[PDB]
Amino acid sequence: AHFKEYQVIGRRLPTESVPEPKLFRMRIFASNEVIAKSRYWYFLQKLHKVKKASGEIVSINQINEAHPTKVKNFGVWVRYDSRSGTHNMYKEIRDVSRVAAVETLYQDMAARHRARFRSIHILKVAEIEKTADVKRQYVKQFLTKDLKFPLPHRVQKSTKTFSYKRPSTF
Amino acid sequence: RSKRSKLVTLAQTDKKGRENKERIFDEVREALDTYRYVWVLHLDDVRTPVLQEIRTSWAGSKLIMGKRKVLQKALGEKREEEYKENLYQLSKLCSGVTGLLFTDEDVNTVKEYFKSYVRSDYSRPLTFTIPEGIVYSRGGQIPAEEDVPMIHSLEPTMRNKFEIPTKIKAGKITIDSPYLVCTEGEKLDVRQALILKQFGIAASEFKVKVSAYYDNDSSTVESTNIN
Amino acid sequence: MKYIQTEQQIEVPEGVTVSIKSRIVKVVGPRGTLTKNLKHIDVTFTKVNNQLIKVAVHNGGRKHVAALRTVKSLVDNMITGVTKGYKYKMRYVYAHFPINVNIVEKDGAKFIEVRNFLGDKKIRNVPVRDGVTIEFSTNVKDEIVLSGNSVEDVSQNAADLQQICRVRNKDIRKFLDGIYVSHKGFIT
RNA sequence: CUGACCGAGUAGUGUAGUGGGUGACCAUACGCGAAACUCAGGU
RNA sequence: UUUGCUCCACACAAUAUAGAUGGAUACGAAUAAGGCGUCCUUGUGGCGUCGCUGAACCAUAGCAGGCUAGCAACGGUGCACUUGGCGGAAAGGCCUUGGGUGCUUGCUGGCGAAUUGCAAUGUCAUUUUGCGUGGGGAUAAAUCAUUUGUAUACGACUUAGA
RNA sequence: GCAGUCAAGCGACAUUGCUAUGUCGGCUCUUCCUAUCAUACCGAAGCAGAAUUCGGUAAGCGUUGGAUUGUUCACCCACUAAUAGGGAACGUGAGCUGGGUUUAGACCGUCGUGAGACAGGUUAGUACCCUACUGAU
RNA sequence: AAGCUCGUAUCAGUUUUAUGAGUAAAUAUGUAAGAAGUCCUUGUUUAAUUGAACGUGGACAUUUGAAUGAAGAGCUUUUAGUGGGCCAUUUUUGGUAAGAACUGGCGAUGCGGGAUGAACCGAACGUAGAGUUAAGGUGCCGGAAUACACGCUCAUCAGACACCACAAAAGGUGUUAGUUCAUCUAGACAGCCGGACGGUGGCCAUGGAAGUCGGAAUCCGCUAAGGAGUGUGUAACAACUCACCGGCCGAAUGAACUAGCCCUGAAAAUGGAUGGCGCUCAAGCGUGUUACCUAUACUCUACCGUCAGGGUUGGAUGCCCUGACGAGUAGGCAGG
RNA sequence: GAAAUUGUUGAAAGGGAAGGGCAUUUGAUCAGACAGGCCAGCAUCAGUUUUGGUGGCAGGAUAAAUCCAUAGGAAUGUAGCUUGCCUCGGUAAGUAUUAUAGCCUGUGGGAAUACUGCCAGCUGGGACUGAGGACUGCGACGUAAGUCAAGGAUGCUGGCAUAAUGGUUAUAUGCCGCCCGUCUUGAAA
């Protein structure tokens, strides 16, 4: 269900006069190992002259979050291919982990820009330990000290189809 | 999409930008050492011709004006950051629209000239009353036989802004009763000041004032305050 | 960006006091009282020191922020009217036909009567709204003053007075006869 | 006149979508995949 | 018309059910606010309390709910009367004085269940209609024919004649 | 349109000289559209008045009588606030009119040796069934 | 349809190995992957059995010459219907808006979905029982969650699922998110007020034209700044006011560009249709995560029939076991 | 002495069509057999299938974490202190890296849980099917005799013995269904 992070390394299978290539690696976000390997191959074929037939995955390992329970301001750089020419996009997402940040980013791109998974390229994701460098207001507002806000217009759910109390909110 | 539109026009002049302020800062810094005496004047409101006449009413000297904060930066707003000996104190006294007259003739002479320099000024005074009939260009302050009736073009200005209940039948501007514009010895309101300025009643007078002086050899602020 | 919370400060002078319940709002002071039904705006009020009141909107958009700001403006206008009051001076001028303005108690409603507008035989009656005092200016020719605690009522009456004398089928550049406002200052 | 992680995994092309786009066209996944060209050498 | 209609009581049938198998349990307004108790110098007042569902309230034990003996209360409640009321939006319903008659599982006892044989919905209500008994109330209309036309192709319509 | 002109984007706006081969038409009838001729209400126009131009919503109503075309082409007189444009098989043959188109006879011009044909002009010609609607048991 | 000769049979609408064919790919197109093959030796046109050719002796039988699959291969007789089909995909041509070459469908086709459809998505059909799915849906009609989670919409003809009967550029001071400049706590923008100067009422035309009815121009002196003056303007002036500068106001603001939703762009005639009801933190849009409804499809089983492989000397065309399958117009055969 | 068509009697339905198909309720009608015919329940079973509980393991950075010990750093600055008036216990800005909160980073330490796959591990409930018809065979439990969930259901019980189940049909309702033949690339036209 949730996105997974895998470290994928390609070998570019060696031959005589071409021994032990540099073993290029990448960080890939995918739901499963197969999709991660497919995305790694797609990126590698574009980056330099390599192919699945003439290459292999050295090793794939899931990158578990170092601190799964910690609020972080993740800086996001994304290249998305719209109907017109593609352009760069920088976003910040306050999330608990890289996986959650990427999952929220995918939904945000799909909604606010109609950018599908095929058209989304993850340039880089970096945790922002500093506070003065945050540039996005919608994430900055949440950094105020002793922040407290209400939940007006609370709506409850009813199991029975008929209610006699005529309920209210809060 | 809803944002305020700009009424900018293709004028023949553009903003000077930050370069002018930086240049003036360096000019002030150089003048601080070029000349002997320095002063911190107050010229919150003065007509340009008055300043031009001042700039040529004395021998070779430099009258330096500029942004208040720029002048403070040139002088320095802290004792540790002061450019010269105790120059921070001189900057501390700069409150309004200040200017510096860099000259070396005599400390007493400069203050005496400031005291004796007086010229006509607007209200920004004695009470005045408009004539009960046709209003003249000077608002009755001179004989009607010499003045000329006010131009009808400015009647909308009189009605909408000056609050005077003017009417135009036989469109030479006329009023139904005498109108009191200013009282005795009071700071006139913006509307009253504009009314007096339009009538050309420059009853007030302006005299240059200085808060303090400085000398390159005294190494301290000459805390002399005259108006 | 759906601000988490935005608010504006309302300054209440010591003389007047305001008691706030569900969005029906009441203002009381030396010049009487005023009320308004703000239930359509969906804003929240809060007491600070009985001298300043904050209106806060949580998770409100740009339209909600504008609604909050106009609520603050309306509250300030109500406070000013209760404290100072408004004096909408109106003037009427004519070229040939002297316009006659009078107050008549026709139907017990204190209708304003206008006659001889450009020689028209029709006589228009403008219903005077509640809480807007009307008095003819003294020693000022062809001037009428409209005053009242509520800005809305006084402004509406002033607009109606000028709208009745609307020139029809004639060149507005020549027929200067009409009713117009001349001032919008406070009674104080 | 030969080699090359050199053009370049670019152009081009088979297969699939109830993929996007009114249209022109475009992207994805399973594959194939060049030449002119570049460096050096040859003559 | 030799006793028809209608109402009430009592007895068998048919006739079915858009579908019982404890109770359709009654303020109003808002949801960027409310219900309840309390207090005051009664208001858009102060205090405490509650929601986060009815997963509640009432009621619920006896051969589909028998026959009998006492205790303590004088309450609970079905039935027919009875006194004073309210309800017209489709009122046909909602209040209450007075006793009478029961049951009372509020509390404690005496006898009976069997064999429907290991379950077979195991029949326990409401809508209509007629004949079989007793008691209450009164003894009319329309159509056809004719007839005048405010009417009409014919119907129909407007009228009159014991 | 032809042949140019400069240039924000990847060629918009502006810019230079001249420049009938078909049959549909008319009397009555009902309805619909606005791209508004007239009427209601308004804004801008050298609206001083009067008169007039354009523009905005608005289809309720009104949008004619005649010289005259068979006519498809389509022009004039007069009244009226005006005499606006269209659709319903460019509605309306078991509604009418056959007006025009189109059989069998016949006259004039061309060709064709001939019979005949036209590039052509003229003449004379064959609901009582169901439903809907209006009334009515 | 009738069959005939052989039988493990050579084959394949498929791939791999080798290479022709192409400045030049890809898809395809050609040949081979050998027992009917290879090798040593030797018999019966060259000067010479030198060599071709067909024989004998000898060497290898099947990891015997790649992968995968094969209700077998070849052969003979005869004939019922069509010889004009239509739709869709690729390539080429033509083209403001059809002609040749390819393959799959309908015609001959049921069943579920798109409210229905000949060209679409699934899936091809014996009669029955149970379960799981396909496309399509989970507000009601309508069997399934007013499912969960993240963002957008106020539309006075919104929106609501490819073929389907379809418009954009462009405009909007509607709304959401991004890219780059430009000024910023020695003071960004809004707002307040003050300055906005002298030569010069610059040269021409003038009756007036002085910053403004006009022509060419557009500089000097001082500034923090001030344009021989951006406009309003009185017959000229003047005055007002714009650019610009000074202060108070005290934290981001301003310009252009990009792409998510909405309106215009997308104007007719009987009254009308996302299918209707109908909906707005949607029951609309993009995307993610789960459980749910089912076709004559798939999985398990009962039965009729067709076909195939075996058993049967004690009703033989007979009886028993096993396995696969059941579409269909013209038409053929067989059994009734 | 047939159908098309018509009348009388009995039954049934009928709100702008009828007729037909799968499916059941109601009305009518109807055949059969009982030292063993029709309809069901329970127990354990062979096959298919659906939904729960629960236990042991195989991998992750021998999961990541959390937690613990250690060194360091920081503010959306904890205590304390200085300034400020003072709502005399207030909070505004300076200092202050744990003090009268704690947070983060690197290292090291002992565990589980999450995800994933396996179990020729156990077990509850629901639905359909009972096909074959004396043995022969493959297997398991037993020292053996024998037994068994091992090449297709047995054991017990109850009601009815009839219109009770069931068939035919009249008609009630859930859904669907266009008018037959020929021709046409295509028809209901």
SS (H, E, C) chain B: CCCCCCCCCCCCCCCCHHHHHHHHHHHHHHHHHHCCEEEEEECCCCCHHHHHHHHHCCCCCEEEECCHHHHHHHHCCCCCCCCCCCHHHHHHCCCCCEEEEEECCCHHHHHHHHHHCEEECCCCCCCEECCCCECECCCCCCCCCCCCECCHHHHHHHHHCCCCCCECCCCCCECCCCCEEECCCCCCCHHHHHHHHHHCCCCCEEECEEEEEEECCCCCEECCCEC
Identity of residue B161: K
| C1: nearest CB among A137, A147, A152 | A137
What fold is seen in the domain C86-188? Outer Surface Protein A; domain 3 (3.90.930)
Which CATH superfamily includes the segment(s) C1-85? Ribosomal protein L6 (3.90.930.12)
Q: Are residues A62 and A30 in the same domain?
A: yes
Chain C residue numbers touching A142 (CB-CB < 8 A): 4
Asked if C13 contacts C61 with a C-beta cutoff of 8 angstroms, the reply is no
A161 within some domain: no
Q: Out of A19, A40, A68, pick the residue that ends a domain.
A: A68
Pair A104, A81 in one domain: yes
> Protein C57 CA to nucleic acid G176 C1', in Å?
20
CA distance A44 to A64: 23
Taking chain C, what is the end-to-end CA distance rounded to the nearest angstrom? 43
Q: In this structure, are A78 and A135 located in the same domain?
A: yes
- Resolution (Å) of this entry: 3.1
Asked if A87 and A53 sit in the same domain, the reply is no
Whether residues A133 and A102 share a domain: the answer is yes
Q: Are 3 or more Cβ–Cβ pairs between A and B shorter than 8 Å?
A: no
User: At A59, which helix (H) or strand (E)?
Assistant: strand A57-62
Backbone angles phi, psi at A122, to 5 degrees: -90, 105
The answer to whether the Cα torsion of B105, B109, B111, B114 is positive or negative is negative
A46 touches strand D (CB under 7 A): yes
User: Looking at A43, A68, A93, which one is the last position of a domain?
Assistant: A68
Judge whether A100 lies within some domain.
yes
Which structural domain, as residue segments, surrounds residue A50?
A: 2-68
**What is the CATH number for A46?**
3.10.20.10
Query: Is residue A153 in a domain?
Result: no
Confirm whether A162 is domain-assigned. no
Contacts 24+ apart (CB under 8 A), C108-114: C110/C134, C112/C161, C114/C164, C114/C165, C114/C179
Chain A residues 102-141 within an 8 A CB cutoff of chain C: 137-138, 141
Instruction: Give B 186-225 residues with CB within 8 A of chain C.
Output: none
Given a contact cutoff of 8 angstroms between Cβ atoms, the answer to whether B200 and B122 are in contact is no
Q: How was this structure determined?
A: cryo-EM
CA distances from residue C44 to A148, B158, C6, C69 in whole angstroms, order as listed: 16, 45, 11, 12
**Residue B203 structure tokens:** 């009853």
Q: Which amino acid is at B55?
A: R
C-alpha distances in Å from residue C108, one per residue of A123, B194, C136, C149, C150: 79, 47, 20, 22, 22
Q: Which of A68, A93, A119 is the last residue of a domain?
A: A68
Amino acid at C142: D
Residues of A in contact with C1 (CB under 8 A): 137-138, 141
Question: Which nucleotide has the least CA–C1' distance to C171?
Answer: F47
> Does residue A40 lie in a domain region?
yes
Tell me if domain C1-85 and domain C86-188 are identical in fold.
yes
Q: In this structure, are A78 and A103 located in the same domain?
A: yes
Instruction: Domain count for chain A, please give it.
Output: 2
Kindly list the domain boundaries of chain C, sorted by start residue. 1-85, 86-188
> Which nucleotides of strand G lie under 7 Å from a protein CB?
147-152, 172-180, 183-184, 186-187, 192-198, 221-227, 229-230, 233-234, 237-240, 242-248, 254-255, 258-261, 281, 285-290
Start-to-end CA span in chain A (Å):
34
Yes or no: say if B179 and B163 are a contact pair by the CB < 8 Å rule.
no
> Cβ separation of C3 and A147 shorter than 8 Å?
no
Checking C40-44 for CB contacts under 8 A at 24+ apart, the result is C41/C67, C41/C70, C41/C71, C42/C67, C43/C67, C43/C68, C43/C71
| Dist CA A12 CA A16 (whole Å) | 13
Give the pairing type, strands C143-148 and C132-136: antiparallel
CB A113 within 8 A of CB A86: no
Closest CA to B40 of B190, B192, B226, B171: B226
Å: A51 CA to F108 C1': 97
For A51, residues 6+ apart whose C-beta sits below 8 A from its C-beta are A45
Residue B151 is encoded by which pair of tokens? Answer: 């131009």
